[PDB]
Design a protein around this nucleic acid. Structure first.
Ligand SMILES: Nc1ccn([C@@H]2O[C@H](COP(=O)(O)OP(=O)(O)OP(=O)(O)O)[C@@H](O)[C@H]2O)c(=O)n1
Ligand SMILES: [Mg+2]
Length: 431
RNA sequence: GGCCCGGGGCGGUUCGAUUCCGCCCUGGGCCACC
């Protein structure tokens, strides 16, 4: 360990050239903003020197009086953001902000209400400046520890808190370091975390609760780890146990033949198909929760129709989106048996038998049963039907897109699509 | 936009639904975009 972590610092700590570049960009931002005479404050990992090597992104916050309208914040904010960046892009889900570059560095110009007491927030990001003040004096000296933690989560796919990841936010990493004292202590204790572990940083306590909860020092009602999924919490805990057991530098390093994949699927004997549709032109933060719903809704449909679904997944390229499925049943019989009433109450038995049927119901164990016919005998046939009539329940945007067009890609043609990596992961193909 | 909790109308399926699949309207929270 001791040694491994030393080498690890070389992958997480920014070199003197990247730091300079960030400082050079910092000064430029101040000079441009001072010329406008705007009120701003630097926050985030850049401000606390906790940003991960190769992930430099400066956060500048524009402070506005709380009396201001949210519309005003949006208009003035974007006005200032655009006038201060070399080039910019504007694309958000709810809270507005401008993304750009200043002297080769990524920058986020974010508008927010300058308040006192983060109790009742007015804009989604009002806590941020307060997180900064709380951390400034506590994280000073332990920033390399935060970086190891970030580099660890990043190299293993659970670093972002955004929906595409559902992992650990940067701020959460910093609270953990403040709570445990170091990357190693965090990892040692995380091995004992549970799905009901509550970490109260301000109280310096860990208690049992109703769900994994990391209390914000700035607001006790805020769960800093709110969007961390159970499975990612589990992957982290399991990763911590492995790292302690066999301390490797590979834990900080970021981690196939389409013809091989065909052989594998052939050997598994499963039904592997995908629902393909055009990708809605919307933010990742809106797209993903929809693909998750769409993916889940179809998966549940496949389970109640007895196709015995194994797993589902999804891929979103720039063109299309794909919802992936694997089922144990490639084809089921046309008939099935519907349970009827007990022979005892004749009223319902009469109604049951009056039903026009093709085979005539029988008695088994004191109750009537009837052979009914399915409307589809293959997983693909059912999904084609489901997705055509229930598109409205597949997410607001993903559902409307599927309404205007979708297709079921199966067999040979499916391995030609940009989903091969996703399938391998989904099927547990190893090597 | 997604999730959670709660109201008020419906339709389909079923011998049988409040409870299965869905659809309108609506109240309150929460999360992602910093
Ligand atoms: N889900 C989020 C996202 C952001 N923030 C706040 O916004 C700040 C800036 O977050 P961001 O710029 O997204 O990342 P950093 O925290 O700066 O860390 P890094 O850029 O390395 O990801 C955080 O410090 C935190 O106070 C938060 O509380 N919760
Ligand atoms: Mg940043």
């Amino acid at each position: 360990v001791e040694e491994i972590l030393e080498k690890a610092l070389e992958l997480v700590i920014p070199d003197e050239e990247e730091v300079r570049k960030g400082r050079e960009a910092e000064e430029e931002l101040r000079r441009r903003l001072d010329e406008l005479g705007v009120e701003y404050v630097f926050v985030g990992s850049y401000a606390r020197n906790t940003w991960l090597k190769g992930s430099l992104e400066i956060d500048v916050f524009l402070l506005f009086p709380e009396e201001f309208s949210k519309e005003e914040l949006r208009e003035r904010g974007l006005e200032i953001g655009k006038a201060v960046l070399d080039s910019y892009e504007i694309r958000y889900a709810e809270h507005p902000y401008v993304h750009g570059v200043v002297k080769g560095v990524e920058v986020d110009v974010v508008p927010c209400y300058k308040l006192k007491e983060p109790k009742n927030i007015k804009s989604a990001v009002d806590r941020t400046p307060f997180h900064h003040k709380w951390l400034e004096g506590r994280i000073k000296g332990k920033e390399n520890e935060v970086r190891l933690l970030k580099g660890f989560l990043k190299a293993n796919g659970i670093y972002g808190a955004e929906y595409k990841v559902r992992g650990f936010s940067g701020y959460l990493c910093e609270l953990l370091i403040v709570f445990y004292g170091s990357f190693l202590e965090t990892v040692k204790n995380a091995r004992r975390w549970t799905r009901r572990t509550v970490i109260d940083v301000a109280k310096g306590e860990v208690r049992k609760g109703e769900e994994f909860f990391v209390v914000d020092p700035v607001d006790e009602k805020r769960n800093v780890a709110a969007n961390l999924s159970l499975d990612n919490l589990a992957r982290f805990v399991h990763l911590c146990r492995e790292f302690m057991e066999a301390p490797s530098l590979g834990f900080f390093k970021p981690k196939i033949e389409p013809e091989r994949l065909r052989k594998i699927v052939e050997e598994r004997g499963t039904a592997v198909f995908a629902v393909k549709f055009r990708k809605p032109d919307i933010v990742d933060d809106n797209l993903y929760p929809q693909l998750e719903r769409a993916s889940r809704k179809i998966f549940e449909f496949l389970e109640r129709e007895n196709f015995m679904p194994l797993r589902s997944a999804f891929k979103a390229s720039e063109e299309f989106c794909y919802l992936l499925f694997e089922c144990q049943i490639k084809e089921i019989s046309r008939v099935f048996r519907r349970m009827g009433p007990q022979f005892e109450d004749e009223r319902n038995v009469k109604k049951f038998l009056s039903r026009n049927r093709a085979f005539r119901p029988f008695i088994e164990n004191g109750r009537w049963w009837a052979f009914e016919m399915r409307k589809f005998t293959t997983p693909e046939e059912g999904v084609r039907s489901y997705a055509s009539t229930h598109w409205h329940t597949l997410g607001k945007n993903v559902g409307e897109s599927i309404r205007e067009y979708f297709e079921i890609i199966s067999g040979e043609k499916l391995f030609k699509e940009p989903v091969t990596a996703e399938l391998c992961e989904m099927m547990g193909v190893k090597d």
